[PDB]
From TrEMBL, chains A, B, C, D:
Signal peptide: none annotated. GO terms for biological process: carbon utilization. This is Carbonic anhydrase. Binds 1 zinc ion per subunit. Its EC number is 4.2.1.1. It holds the Pfam family Pro_CA. The keyword Zinc applies. One of its GO terms (molecular function) is zinc ion binding. Reversible hydration of carbon dioxide. Keywords: Lyase, Metal-binding, Zinc. Belongs to the beta-class carbonic anhydrase family.
Length: 222, 222, 222, 222
């Protein structure tokens, strides 16, 4: 017995309550949406953006994937990015990781010979890890795990800022801000891990890796 | 203007309110997760699964992408599927489309020459459309849109069922059901489009495309 | 003992002979290339385009993959396509399949539950197969295999013509032709399976699937 | 103008000429293939492996893409790797870059905002570049280009070695070597850049990045 009845009943009860409380709660976004936020976070069942920020339908457009990864070569994450920045004109991009992230643990501990698609998928985390060996070697398994989480949020903010989409948006004057935040499943709170970035100037100040050199590498050539 | 303060206050208020109603609402989920559902749905800002099924943290692991598309060759969606079926051992997979879906409209109206990554990405939508062109010819814009959304849900339910991850899970007797639902953003309500599929037999009864023929094609060669 | 010596010696011997015969054979393409052909064919070791067409370096730009597949969502094949049409201004695209293609056999006979990346990868062939059940059911394994090969070449020519790259090139007046050909490893010969396509007009005439309806689907709506 | 006749005559002439020199040149390869090599190389029209190593049909299975890039998350290249190592049981993997490589130049000079898929695709080249920025600072355009080509070969040899497919093959005692070569289009000559790697021990001796640390990172956690 798989039977969706309880789910459907809970959905009807929820829809009624919201409309009873505000009669245009739903009808106002019947035929259109204008979110101001894109949120990129982990598929993990404990981390639901609309509910942890207590948001109404129509406020946050959402990519959720194993590990909250952003890569220029993932058309799944990239079309979420292009569609919200180019078509919907969002103003803020939230990259959120969270403690006790299983993707980030697999990234520390799995041997690359491990079978299946998840191990391909988290290659990104291994690479972030490998560049940051000096911050992780010799920590206890637990501290290394937490640290892996933060380091990944920082890498993924950098990847957002370096993406063709965000770079083209900045170059044409479209206001757009990027945010690194992390969530703790055990307390329900979100901490700002990286202050707002609104263009190259902020990025130079706020990120370890050098975004200007990434974009304009050929200036450092003779 | 780029300040995150409104969001953090909201998150605080939200976390206290939940910790009041229930002492262990967060603490019980601090170091692991045992969700029973995987949800695959559209990235659209109006369709938030934990909110709309009114679920607590830890109940639904989430993939969201533009058009709620499921392909064997997308490692982003596939790793959500593999990690939940193989590692977390979920029992139910929700495939959820929604009326007023911009991805589905784009898959009806855009010309293939359109530049950018969203247009590459929604190629699956054109395939569903083309296979079912007889069902869509001479309907009105708005009716073809609604029909496209529904055909897309059915196609994606087929793709979940046909996936290596689900086929392997069934073949080793892991119990796993797959469901097609559609959400109406204007009313907040979910409607079951496809009754529960728990194995090959259900799929023979419930899907228009032949799953058995797909899996055992060579049985019908001389 | 892995030792590249024999390979390197054969390469030196070959380079000498060609330069001895035509002293600018290599030097003329030292610093640049201007191929007129893109070739898309199978990774299979028996099928080398430059050698079967007896071509000099600098003549045919080459994508080779398992099964000779073209999909808008494969950035590997797609960047080969964009780079040669947009940057190098090639004039002709050869899509070549071949008999005794192992990808095309796996596409007939593997069960989708089969582990590993090749089985994900050839999902494209299964889909071509599924649409063409009526041409394949009841044939002997051998005739079905040959037929699968031709059907795949036709699908992939259609995919070339439908790609954003080729569509944008035609729409801006750039001359570009697409060709379906097949090769027989046992005789070293190539047969033209589909006559030249240079735009929509030819495509309407030469391909079973309807390219015009694919591009302009919304014209058939009320 | 779109006529294929010149090509078919060339193919004929070519097939007869080979069938004369050797009776069974094609017939011996008509129904199967047992290549000993997999070659991964650039799609560039001047670099044809079977031609340049002067090989007969059936000897080298080929992947070619723009920049000869190897990533765990590209199913196109990965299926070439899995099918050859696991099904065909090849013994040697050639990773081949080439001077004058347009992909490598693009990875030095293009700004990330550049539109289209080639720019997404060559993101791996920017990563190699960035990790090795110290090695490239204040070199001249042309020298940085040559150094980029070489660093790219080494990075891609590392990625082949680090892949799940090769790590699994070694771990079950399958003999498998990996080689880094570079071709000079101006002279037709190949130079060995990296001596043969046949297992973990060779990679410790031959590669600048630490393969063991990459595979066994968690050994160095407290
Ligand atoms: Cl969500
Ligand atoms: Cl080749
Ligand atoms: Zn996580
Ligand atoms: Zn949608
Ligand atoms: Zn083949
Ligand atoms: Zn190249």
């Amino acid at each position: 017995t798989a039977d969706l009845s309880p789910l459907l009943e809970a959905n009807r009860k929820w829809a009624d309550e919201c409309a009873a409380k505000d009669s245009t709660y739903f009808s106002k976004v019947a035929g259109s949406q204008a979110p101001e936020y894109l949120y990129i976070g982990c598929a993990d069942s404990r981390v639901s953006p609309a509910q942890l920020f207590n948001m109404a339908p129509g406020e946050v457009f959402v990519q959720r994937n194993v590990g909250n990864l952003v890569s220029n070569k993932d058309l799944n994450c990239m079309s979420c990015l292009e569609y919200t920045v180019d078509h919907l004109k969002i103003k803020h991009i939230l990259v959120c990781g969270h403690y006790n992230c299983g993707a980030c643990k697999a990234g520390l501990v799995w041997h690359p010979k491990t079978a299946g698609v998840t191990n391909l998928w988290i290659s990104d985390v291994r690479e972030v890890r490998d560049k940051n060996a000096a911050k992780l070697h010799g920590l206890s398994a637990d501290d290394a795990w937490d640290k892996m989480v933060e380091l990944n949020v920082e890498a993924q903010v950098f990847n957002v800022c370096a993406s063709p989409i965000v770079q083209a948006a900045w170059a044409r004057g479209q206001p757009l801000s990027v945010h690194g935040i992390v969530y703790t499943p055990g307390t329900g709170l979100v901490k700002e891990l990286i202050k707002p970035i609104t263009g190259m100037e902020d990025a130079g100040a706020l990120l370890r890796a050098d975004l200007k050199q990434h974009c304009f590498f050929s200036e450092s050539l003779a």
